[PDB]
Amino acid sequence: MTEYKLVVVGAGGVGKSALTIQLIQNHFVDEYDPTIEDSYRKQVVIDGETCLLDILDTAGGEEYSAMRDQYMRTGEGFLCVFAINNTKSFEDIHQYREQIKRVKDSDDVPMVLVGNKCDLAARTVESRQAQDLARSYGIPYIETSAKTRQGVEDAFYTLVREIRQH
Ligand SMILES: Nc1nc2c(ncn2[C@@H]2O[C@H](COP(=O)(O)OP(=O)(O)O)[C@@H](O)[C@H]2O)c(=O)[nH]1
Ligand SMILES: [Mg+2]
Ligand SMILES: [Mg+2]
């Protein structure tokens, strides 16, 4: 099997844990401990290839562990998540990307911009705003809901396909 090492980054409360849990367990969590930072594994077939996903769900900000740094340094691709009803989290994306570029010493890192909570009414961040940001980075933009599952497979599987182009 090929293994793909994925790291999920973004502001607290955007749904990084909910997205990972949805992908792995097919269930939506209302209140997952916001400090739990751990890795999760899933065997999936993507485009006819059986592979293993090794996903680090990052927590808790302005902090670094041995595992975090390892996945950050050895992560092959990054989901950069914001919530479409959280303007600050969208504005924060720039910092996560700058961080990733520094760790990787590269502006060419497999990455997907994820606008999560698309089930919630009256977004404060427009799709076209996020499209314009992702275009400036040279990366895809995908909207998701950890609640309904909309886009969740699409985001993680696209990141896998980005890593494959690399
Ligand atoms: N309505 C809705 N709520 C979500 C979604 N994703 C996460 N949440 C909620 O947002 C809050 C933060 O989610 P969490 O996964 O802990 O965010 P994290 O800090 O980035 O890991 C929780 O109350 C989740 O139930 C979503 O797609 N839709
Ligand atoms: Mg979390
Ligand atoms: Mg506005």
Curated annotation (Swiss-Prot):
Q: Topology relative to the membrane, per the entry?
A: Lipid-anchor
Q: What is its main location?
A: membrane
Task: Kindly state which keywords UniProt assigns to this record, in alphabetical order.
Answer: Acetylation, Cell membrane, Cytoplasm, Disease variant, Glycoprotein, Golgi apparatus, GTP-binding, Hydrolase, Isopeptide bond, Lipoprotein, Membrane, Methylation, Nucleotide-binding, Nucleus, Palmitate, Prenylation, Proto-oncogene, S-nitrosylation, Ubl conjugation
* Sites bearing S-nitrosocysteine, chain numbering: C118
Q: Which residues carry this modification: N-acetylmethionine?
A: M1
The enzyme's main class, written as a single word, is: hydrolase
Where, in this chain's numbering, is GTP bound? 13-18, 29-35, 59-60, 116-119, 145-147
UniProt note on tissues of expression: Widely expressed.
Keyword presence, Cytoplasm = yes
Where, per UniProt, does this protein localize? Cell membrane; Golgi apparatus; Golgi apparatus membrane
Xref: Gene3D superfamilies: P-loop containing nucleotide triphosphate hydrolases (3.40.50.300)
The record ties this protein, via SUPFAM superfamilies, to: P-loop containing nucleoside triphosphate hydrolases
User: How changing D38N affects the protein?
Assistant: No effect on interaction with PLCE1
The effect annotated for G12V is:
In CSTLO, bladder carcinoma and CMEMS; constitutively activated; interacts and recruits PLCE1 to plasma membrane
Q: Per UniProt, what does mutating Y32F do?
A: Loss of interaction and recruitment to plasma membrane of PLCE1
What, per the annotation, is the impact of changing S39C?
No effect on interaction with PLCE1
Q: List the disulfide bonds.
A: none
**Can you tell me which residues are glycosylated?**
T35
Instruction: Specify the effect of N26G.
Output: Loss of interaction with PLCE1
Q: Its biological function? A: Involved in the activation of Ras protein signal transduction. Ras proteins bind GDP/GTP and possess intrinsic GTPase activity.
Disease link: Costello syndrome: A rare condition characterized by prenatally increased growth, postnatal growth deficiency, intellectual disability, distinctive facial appearance, cardiovascular abnormalities (typically pulmonic stenosis, hypertrophic cardiomyopathy and/or atrial tachycardia), tumor predisposition, skin and musculoskeletal abnormalities. Congenital myopathy with excess of muscle spindles: Variant of Costello syndrome.
Family to which this protein belongs: Belongs to the small GTPase superfamily. Ras family.
UniProt name for this protein: GTPase HRas
Q: Which species expresses this protein natively?
A: Homo sapiens (Human)
